[PDB]
């Protein structure tokens, strides 16, 4: 609710700035590079989204291909949870290895 109202004050104010912005425009009336920077930063979001869609579809095809007469079954369940565990275990391993590496620095 705090995080939810922080997205109310910091929105109404963001809307409030637009007046001083239009005022600044009013002052100036009497760039493209940034506009390229924003679209450039924004364009990859669409790529992330599309990539996500792809991955989802790949998952759909693999899951449906391997099994498609009982999508509410406990196999894909074990598969998924077990994948989760694999990923988490990988994270643990890698980060632990990183910390282990970090100790060698203190071995001076």
């Amino acid at each position: 609710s705090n995080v939810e109202s922080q997205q109310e004050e910091l929105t109404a104010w963001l809307d409030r700035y637009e007046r001083e912005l239009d005022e600044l425009y009013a002052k100036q009336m009497g760039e493209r590079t940034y506009k390229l920077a924003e679209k450039l930063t924004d364009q990859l979001d669409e790529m992330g989204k599309d990539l996500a869609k792809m991955i989802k579809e790949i998952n759909d095809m693999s899951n449906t291909l391997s099994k498609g007469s009982k999508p509410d079954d406990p196999l894909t369940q074990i598969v998924r949870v077990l994948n989760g565990h694999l990923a988490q275990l990988q994270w643990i391993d890698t980060n632990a290895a990183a910390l282990q590496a970090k100790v060698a620095a203190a071995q001076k």
Binding site: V3, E4, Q7, L10, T11, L14, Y17, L21, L24, Y25, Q28, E31, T33, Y34, K35, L36, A37, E38, L40, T41, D42, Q43, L44, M47, D50, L51, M54, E57, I58, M61, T64, L65, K67, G68, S69, K70, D73, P74, L75, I78, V81, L82, H85, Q88, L89, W91, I92, N95, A96, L99, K102, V103, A106
Partner: protein, 144 residues
């Protein structure tokens, strides 16, 4: 049940919704933070560290706007659709073993596997937190 009902529905939606609202407001924030660096700083004297900025921007922009890099995705998609059609066909062909599949899967070992999985999850969580602590406790020594 009450706690789970709250979480599984009332809170998840607000979390996701709030995250998307953050993203949107981040975009707006950068947009404003961008226009500020336009209208006020339109005194033609915009240089210095700008070169480095547009250098980085040009590098990443050049890396993105490539034929091959852009083409790989398009090629991949069709390359996926091939397997989509192929798999769907081969699936429809072998769309008969349903009882063998459902009954073959439904078993008893599954219950035990679930248990072993939960145990693994607990052990994994413990290890994860232990490493987390090992990190947090080391970055202290990093200062001293």
């Amino acid at each position: 049940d009450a706690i789970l009902s709250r979480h599984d529905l009332d809170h998840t939606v607000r979390a996701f919704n709030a995250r998307r609202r953050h993203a949107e407001l981040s975009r707006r924030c950068l947009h404003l933070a961008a226009r500020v660096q336009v209208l006020r700083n339109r005194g033609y004297a915009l240089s210095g560290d700008e070169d480095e900025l547009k250098q980085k921007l040009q590098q990443i922009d050049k890396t993105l706007n490539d034929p091959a890099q852009g083409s790989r995705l398009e090629e991949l998609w069709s390359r996926l659709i091939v397997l989509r059609g192929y798999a769907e066909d081969l699936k429809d062909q072998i769309n008969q073993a349903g009882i063998t599949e459902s009954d073959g899967l439904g078993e008893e070992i599954e219950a035990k596997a679930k248990k072993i999985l939960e145990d693994y999850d607990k052990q994994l969580q413990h290890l994860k937190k232990q490493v987390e602590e090992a990190k947090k406790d080391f970055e202290e020594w990093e200062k001293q």
